[PDB]
C-alpha cells in the first residue's frame, strides 16, 4: 500500500 | 552508486490494461492511492468481462518495464515492440499494493493509469521511486541547485534551526 509522487512532476507540471 | 538507473533497468511484468481518469493540480499521496485503487478495479472488472469474452472461443499480456531517470516505457515481452513510452517527468505517481503495479502519467487534468501485475511489484515500484528522485535531483542540479547534495545538508539545518 505504498505510492510515491514525482517531485519533478508535482513540480514544473502541477 | 547511482548510475544504475540513469542508464536504466528492466523488470518482467504483466499488463492488464489501462484506465483514464480526472485529477486536479496537486492532490495527495493519500487521495492518489484512492484513485489508483479505483483505477485497478476498473481494469480488473474490465478483465473479468475480458475473460468471459473468451468463453465464446490468456487475457493479460507479458511486458518488460524499462525504468530510468529519463523515461519509463513498456514493451512487448515477445515482439519487443513499444506499447507506450512516457518521459519520466510526465509520470506523477506509482504504487505497489500486492503484486499489482499501477502508475499514472499525464495523457498528452486528464491522467492515464496503467495496470500491471508482477511478483516483483514490490521491488518494481521502489525502483521507479528512486528514478523519481535520481531523475528529480538531476532535474534539480541542472537548475543550479548543484547543492542538491548540499540542499539536504540544508533542508535539515533549516528545520532544527527552526526551533
UniProtKB/Swiss-Prot annotation, chain A:
Effect of residue 7 to A: Little APP internalization. Reduced amyloid-beta protein 42 secretion
Positions bearing the Glycyl lysine isopeptide (Lys-Gly) (interchain with G-Cter in ubiquitin) cross-link: 10
Region annotated Required for the interaction with KIF5B and for anterograde transport in axons, chain positions: 3-14
Motif YENPXY motif: where in chain: 4-9
Impact upon substituting residue 4 to A: Little APP internalization. Reduced amyloid-beta protein 42 secretion
Phenotype upon changing residue 4 to G: Loss of binding to MAPK8IP1, APBA1, APBB1, APPBP2 and SHC1
Positions of modified residues (Phosphotyrosine): 4
Name of the protein: C31
Species name: Homo sapiens
Portion held of the full protein: 754 to 767 of 770
From Swiss-Prot, chain B:
Entire protein: shown range: 365 to 552 of 750
Tissues in which the protein is found: Brain.
Gene source species: Rattus norvegicus
Domain remark from Swiss-Prot or TrEMBL: Composed of an N-terminal domain that binds STXBP1, a middle phosphotyrosine-binding domain (PID/PTB) that mediates binding with the cytoplasmic domain of the amyloid-beta precursor protein, and two C-terminal PDZ domains thought to attach proteins to the plasma membrane.
Role played: Putative function in synaptic vesicle exocytosis by binding to STXBP1, an essential component of the synaptic vesicle exocytotic machinery. May modulate processing of the amyloid-beta precursor protein (APP) and hence formation of APP-beta.
Cysteine disulfide partners in this protein: none
Record's subunit section: Part of a multimeric complex containing STXBP1 and syntaxin-1. Binds to the cytoplasmic domain of amyloid-beta protein, and to the nuclear factor NF-kappa-B/p65 via its PDZ domain. Interacts with the N-terminal domain of NECAB3.
Name of the protein described by the UniProt record: Amyloid-beta A4 precursor protein-binding family A member 2
Residue ranges annotated for the PID domain, each copy included: 7-163
Amino acid at each position: 500500500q505504498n505510492g510515491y509522487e514525482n517531485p519533478t512532476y508535482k513540480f514544473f507540471e502541477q | 552508486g547511482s548510475e544504475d538507473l540513469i542508464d536504466g533497468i528492466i523488470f518482467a511484468a504483466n499488463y492488464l490494461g489501462s484506465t483514464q481518469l480526472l485529477s486536479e493540480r496537486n492532490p495527495s499521496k493519500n487521495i492518489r492511492m484512492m484513485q489508483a485503487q479505483e483505477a485497478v478495479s476498473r481494469v480488473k472488472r474490465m478483465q473479468k468481462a475480458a475473460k468471459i469474452k473468451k468463453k465464446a472461443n490468456q487475457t493479460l499480456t507479458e511486458v518488460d518495464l524499462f525504468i530510468s531517470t529519463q523515461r519509463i516505457k513498456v514493451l512487448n515481452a515477445d515482439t519487443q515492440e513499444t506499447m507506450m513510452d512516457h518521459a519520466l517527468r510526465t509520470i506523477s505517481y506509482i504504487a505497489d499494493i500486492g503484486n499489482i503495479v499501477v502508475l499514472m502519467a499525464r495523457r498528452r487534468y486528464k491522467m492515464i493509469c496503467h495496470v500491471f501485475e508482477s511478483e516483483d511489484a514490490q521491488l518494481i515500484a521502489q525502483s521507479i521511486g528512486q528514478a523519481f528522485s535520481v531523475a528529480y535531483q538531476e532535474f534539480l542540479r541542472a537548475n543550479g541547485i548543484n547543492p542538491e547534495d548540499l540542499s539536504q545538508k540544508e533542508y535539515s539545518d533549516i528545520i532544527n534551526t527552526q526551533e
